[PDB]
Design a protein around this ligand. Structure first.
Ligand SMILES: CCCCCCCCCCCCCCCCCC(=O)O
Ligand SMILES: CCCCCCCCCCCCCCCC(=O)O
Ligand SMILES: CCCCCCCCCCCCCCCC(=O)O
Ligand SMILES: CCCCCCCCCC
Lengths: 385, 385
């Protein structure tokens, strides 16, 4: 709807590009095509623009390379079999049908594999080009004319699809990984405070996005290694994998926020009066952790190094004060009368469970800090100063 | 190769059926056709099979409905604009070019709405059919003839595809949802046993599969509604929506096994000497929970109702016994000399979190039992006599 466009004008630009490219093709065929032969197979160029035009440059480049490899191999095999069939005269069809059967079975078995999956389009292109080349030419003997004619009419369509995408308003794939890495930190920082406030009162997406985005970052890293140097990224081998390593380090910490949110939604709960004895320490720990995560996200957004001061001092001190307070009032968690109702005991122990989970969350931050240091060192970030 | 060629003969049958379909189409094109009257139009029938053959019988029907509404809306548009462009006698190809631009822009915009993913094939067929119809037939009075001809062969290819797929060997999705549910029931129990065994030592795949498959169940439910009654599922409207409820209840129960697995990999751990004090009760609770989950899975597999005895009586006793033990030795988890180091306190307190999380897992089973009863009542299960 209009709202979606206004919010994301980029998509409108992509649609405009698609339309300008199809218009260019259509005009080049409506006017500048005097040769009659092309007319016979001139509807082959305006159908290579609707399949190779992708959102990013890297995706377009890699998928086009795969499709061209598939098409070339299929054409070569088809022509070879066509030439070899003539040996057995009067039995041509009884050979070409067995060939189409063996090749359909093979090109259908290898795709169903998990390793070779995620590359179906190439197998489909191979099977379609083999069937087309075998059936089309047949006895007429034009097994090579058709091939070179169509390859050379597809090439023009793919060139017109690539030039317009690359030279109007490029949408690079290496900046979406940077922006998703930036966004995850803020999502987790919001989730932690949301959970703490929800537990202390008288989130969902925040941790799902961090815990459920590895595949998107792996696809964006597969597309980002194909793009040439541009803008802030000038090295010839940008360490795109340290972003994934930092994302994993952050997901390992977000699993504890997921466990705390699941602790909020439990069947057995504790009396509010008991929870209101530890409010200050929990709120301090939550504020400190949110501040640390937001500072790390801000330093990742601006491509800057860490300063001299230690960032984990205050959160460590807050967690130590929390531990001291828990140690001072431990008589509200266990039953001291008997020492040699189940619901009451579970309610008593749910508070120690919550505190232990918060302490584990505070203890899992050093790995994220180390991963950030490694990324800022291999990626040549600038001095904060 | 042989790994799945022998561990899953379903794929060899799928590939052999696609080969037999291609061979049938090829023989019908080469032998039956008396003379080369449609030599170039006899490939649209051998290129539809490669794009209409799916794994299940409901996916073929649904994607065929979508592709047959998108292969006719474009045709109607093209035929209704080729009789309107004539009005502009001078600006003919200019008006056709503006039409192609507008239609491509509109389709590309409407293909990116976040609500319309999982249908890109329909918009692609729409654009390719509008472009083919408009470009291929120009001035030459063959719009309607070209369309009738191009639709008289895709129908035969689709009929051959849907006869081979269905009448040789059919794969149904309503028989795959049941198997997925049974597999999830088995995996959750295996993970539950593994977690306790690992914690008491002197798992990942199960809950990870049973918590990250909702999309597969939703797709299988969307495909299973198109299929006609067959085998044991003899009813006009089978309650396929009562399997998803049980799957969701099992995922809610498995989140606690995921939290216990996260407890195993924590940075703060309790001493072994204090762990060995509660071995028996934890082993009993794990055994009882695994037995109950396996019993429910076996009852689901055989399509049988629950008997007259309570299925939660033993685990409810086990989880109560553990509580009593916690009451008798609480001094091993708290410091009773400070009532008025952090690492030692956290190590002591982790055991209460692990035991308190197993109590939550034991408490979350009534919802799964209720969902099973509802499913067995709505689906007309048989008496367990
Ligand atoms: C993605 C859909 C693919 C549809 C393609 C239809 C058929 C394409 C025809 C391709 C003709 C060129 C193939 C290469 C022939 C030359 C190979 C060679 O001998 O080295
Ligand atoms: C209907 C056909 C669609 C698929 C066609 C294959 C995809 C186009 C591939 C074009 C490859 C052009 C050659 C690439 C290498 C080069 O730039 O020289
Ligand atoms: C790539 C697939 C599209 C090419 C095939 C297009 C064939 C025409 C589509 C059906 C036209 C529908 C309009 C009514 C046709 C009729 O009068 O029979
Ligand atoms: C080429 C896209 C699919 C067109 C055929 C759809 C199946 C039903 C045709 C009557």
């Amino acid at each position: 709807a209009w709202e979606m466009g206004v919010s994301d004008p980029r998509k409108i630009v992509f649609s405009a590009k698609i339309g300008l490219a199809l218009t260019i093709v259509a005009l080049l065929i409506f006017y500048q095509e005097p040769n009659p032969d092309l007319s016979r197979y001139s509807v082959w160029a305006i159908l290579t623009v609707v399949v190779v035009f992708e959102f990013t440059i890297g995706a377009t480049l890699s998928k086009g390379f795969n499709r061209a490899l598939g098409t070339l191999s299929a054409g070569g095999l088809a022509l070879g079999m066509a030439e070899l069939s003539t040996l057995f005269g009067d039995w041509e069809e009884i050979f070409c049908t067995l060939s189409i059967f063996c090749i359909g079975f093979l090109a259908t078995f290898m795709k169903l594999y998990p390793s070779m999956k995620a590359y179906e389009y190439g197998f489909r292109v191979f099977l379609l080009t083999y069937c087309y080349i075998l059936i089309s030419g047949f006895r007429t003997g034009q097994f090579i004319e058709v091939a070179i004619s169509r390859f050379l009419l597809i090439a023009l369509g793919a060139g017109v699809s690539l030039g317009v995408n690359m030279f109007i308003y490029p949408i690079w794939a290496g900046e979406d990984l940077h922006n998703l890495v930036v966004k995850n930190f803020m999502n987790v920082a919001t989730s932690l405070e949301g959970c703490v406030n929800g537990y202390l009162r008288c989130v969902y997406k925040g941790y799902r996005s961090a815990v459920e985005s590895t595949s998107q970052e792996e696809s964006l890293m597969s597309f980002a290694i194909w793009e040439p140097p541009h803008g802030p990224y000038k090295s010839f081998n940008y360490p795109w994998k340290n972003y994934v390593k930092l994302s994993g380090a952050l997901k390992h910490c977000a699993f504890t926020v997921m466990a705390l949110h699941g602790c909020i939604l439990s069947e057995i709960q504790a009396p509010e009066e008991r929870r209101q004895v530890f409010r200050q320490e929990l709120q301090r720990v939550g504020v400190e952790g949110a501040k640390l995560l937001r500072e790390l996200g801000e330093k990742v957004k601006k491509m800057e190094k860490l300063g001299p001061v230690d960032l984990l001092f205050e959160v460590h001190l807050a967690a130590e004060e929390l531990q001291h307070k828990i140690d001072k009032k431990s008589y509200l968690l266990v039953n001291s009368e008997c020492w040699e109702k189940t619901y009451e005991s579970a309610s008593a122990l749910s508070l120690a469970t919550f505190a232990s989970l918060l302490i584990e969350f505070v203890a899992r931050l050093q790995n994220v800090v180390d991963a950030f240091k490694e990324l800022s060192q291999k990626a040549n970030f600038k001095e904060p100063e």
